[PDB]
């Protein structure tokens, strides 16, 4: 009876008031799923809990204390029980795509038995081999070309009606999505931040009135020269859903962006040009000038890196449904040949999402495929939960290589204390010299704040 965070609902109906069939979350329950509640709240949001308690937003460190709130965190009085556990990821070391797929489909405890049991619990017949009395044992794994086929061994003979018509578990359409947040690295092989030059000058206010209305801004461009290797071949097929910035390691700054819908392996490095954009709005006293300075740095860094790529695939259950016991919502009693594919990974549609179907199993309007409530009645909730937890356990492949980058950047434009004499600048810039240092099209300008 844990509190399931996805069944929480925030109501805005008055102090301690929930919607129909909801009851307020109490301070103990809230504390048990604090991070989940707080992550759904506004920075300084304060939300009600049962009996005069409130939970506060992340700005307040999600504290739980006595308080009055006209909005309330609520939970069903009759929740949907037995949520499918989200197990920790199943890691597959980096390797070629064949290596990765090979390890996954030959895995008895983590793949063959769980998917075999799924099909069995759904009503599919003969999900096992001839030399075993148990489901998902004596299973041959063969190739369908691009896809894999897991099916009970059929050599020799068997006892049962249509026993030679072994149900087939098919695995196809593998996808690999790199999770940027999974980043980690080894020893930072090389690191350092070097001052190559200091650009110094003056901003002068030759008027009888203090000047505060001029932006002083630096523009131009540098370049980050970088490279990244891929230890194995899976990287050829790995992509990221969204563009992201190469992570910051150390006390330097890089502006590298990894592009979405593009092969990890095709993104191996080069020269990414970066714009200089520092700006500041100084106040210069009347008839005085201020020292303005900009430090120009260069830095490099190298390390072995690693990311994880979430592995997804189509799981197609193919065989006939047992008479007097199957989960299809119309419960066919004519042992029809059946085909159904689940997408093991992110959601694509309702028909292929086990999680969606399971979570929505008490909404009759939604039961258009498998009747998960019937699987529970047959096997018990626990059995079904544990099985789906394994079927849906995240599979992740390690994506490794070496990273190396050489960068150039400016620090902030700094302003000094005023010395006696619109706003004007006196800051010498030598284009060629600057170019030699990796700083191009450099300019320093004054413009009104308007």
Mind telling me the CATH superfamily name of the largest domain? Proaerolysin, chain A, domain 3
Largest sheet data: 15 strands, mixed
Report the portion of residues in β strands.
35-45%
Q: Supply the CATH class of the largest domain.
A: Mainly Beta
State the helix count. 8
CATH topology of the largest domain: Proaerolysin, Chain A, domain 3
Shape: flat
Helix share of residues?
A: 10-25%
Query: Span between N and C termini?
Result: 60 Å
Count all strands and give the number.
23
Which CATH architecture of the largest domain is right?
Beta Complex
Structural class: mainly beta
Provide the gyration radius in Å: 31 Å
Q: How many structural domains does the protein architecture include?
A: 3
InterPro entries: Aerolysin-like_C, Aerolysin/haemolysin_CS, Aerolysn, APT_dom, APT_N_sf, CTDL_fold
Organism: Aeromonas hydrophila
GO molecular function: identical protein binding; toxin activity
Main location: secreted
List the SSEs and their pairings:
Layout: E1 9-11, E2 22-24, H1 27-32, H2 34-38, E3 46-49, E4 53-56, E5 64-66, E6 72-76, E7 90-92, H3 97-105, H4 108-122, E8 139-143, E9 148-152, E10 168-185, E11 190-205, E12 214-228, E13 244-245, E14 257-258, E15 269-276, E16 279-280, E17 288-320, E18 337-344, H5 354-359, H6 372-379, H7 381-391, E19 395-410, E20 414-415, E21 419-420, E22 424-426, H8 431-437, E23 440-448
Parallel strand pairs: 7-19
Antiparallel strand pairs: 1-6, 2-6, 3-4, 4-5, 8-9, 9-10, 10-17, 11-17, 11-22, 12-15, 12-16, 12-19, 12-23, 13-14, 17-18, 17-19, 17-20, 17-21
Helix pairs in contact: 4-7, 6-7
């Amino acid at each position: 009876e844990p509190v399931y965070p996805d069944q929480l609902r925030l109501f805005s109906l008055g102090q301690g008031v929930c919607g129909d069939k909801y009851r307020p979350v109490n301070r103990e329950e809230a504390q048990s799923v604090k991070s989940n509640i707080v992550g759904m709240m506004g920075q300084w949001q304060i939300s009600g809990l049962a009996n005069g308690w409130v939970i506060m937003g992340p700005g307040y460190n999600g504290e739980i204390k006595p308080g009055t709130a006209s909005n309330t965190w609520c939970y069903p009085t009759n929740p949907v029980t037995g949520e499918i556990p989200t197990l920790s990821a199943l890691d597959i070391p980096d390797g070629d795509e064949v290596d990765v797929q090979w390890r996954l489909v030959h895995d008895s405890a983590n793949f063959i038995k769980p998917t075999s049991y799924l099909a069995h619990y759904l009503g599919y017949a003969w999900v096992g081999g001839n030399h075993s009395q148990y489901v998902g044992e004596d299973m041959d794994v063969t190739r369908d070309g691009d896809g894999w086929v897991i099916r009970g061994n059929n050599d020799g003979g068997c006892d049962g009606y249509r026993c030679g018509d072994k149900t087939a578990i098919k695995v196809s359409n593998f996808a690999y999505n790199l999770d940027p947040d999974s980043f980690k690295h080894g020893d930072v092989t090389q690191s350092d931040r070097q001052l190559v030059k200091t650009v110094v000058g003056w901003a002068v206010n030759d008027s009888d009135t203090p000047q505060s209305g001029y932006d002083v801004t630096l523009r131009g461009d540098t370049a980050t020269n970088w490279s990244k290797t891929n230890t194995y071949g899976l990287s050829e097929k790995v992509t990221t859903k969204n563009k992201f910035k190469w992570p910051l390691v150390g006390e330097t700054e890089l502006s590298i962006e990894i592009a979405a819908n593009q092969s990890w392996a095709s993104q191996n490095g080069g020269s990414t040009t970066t714009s200089l954009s520092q700006s500041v709005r100084p106040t210069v006293p009347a008839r005085s000038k201020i020292p303005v300075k900009i430090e120009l740095y260069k830095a490099d860094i190298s390390y072995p890196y690693e990311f994880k790529a979430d592995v997804s695939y189509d799981l197609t259950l193919s065989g006939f449904l047992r008479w007097g016991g199957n989960a299809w919502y119309t419960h066919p009693d004519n042992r029809p040949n059946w085909n159904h594919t689940f997408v093991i990974g992110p959601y694509k549609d309702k028909a292929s999402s086990i999680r969606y179907q399971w979570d929505k199993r008490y909404i009759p309007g939604e039961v258009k495929w498998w009747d998960w409530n019937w699987t529970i009645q047959q096997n018990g909730l626990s059995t079904m939960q544990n099985n789906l937890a394994r079927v849906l356990r995240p599979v992740r492949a390690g994506i490794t290589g070496d990273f190396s980058a050489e960068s150039q950047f400016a620090g902030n434009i700094e302003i000094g204390a005023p010395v006696p004499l619109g706003l004007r600048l006196e800051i010498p810039l030598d284009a060629q010299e600057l170019s030699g240092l990796g700083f191009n099209n450099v300019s320093l300008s004054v413009t009104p704040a308007a």
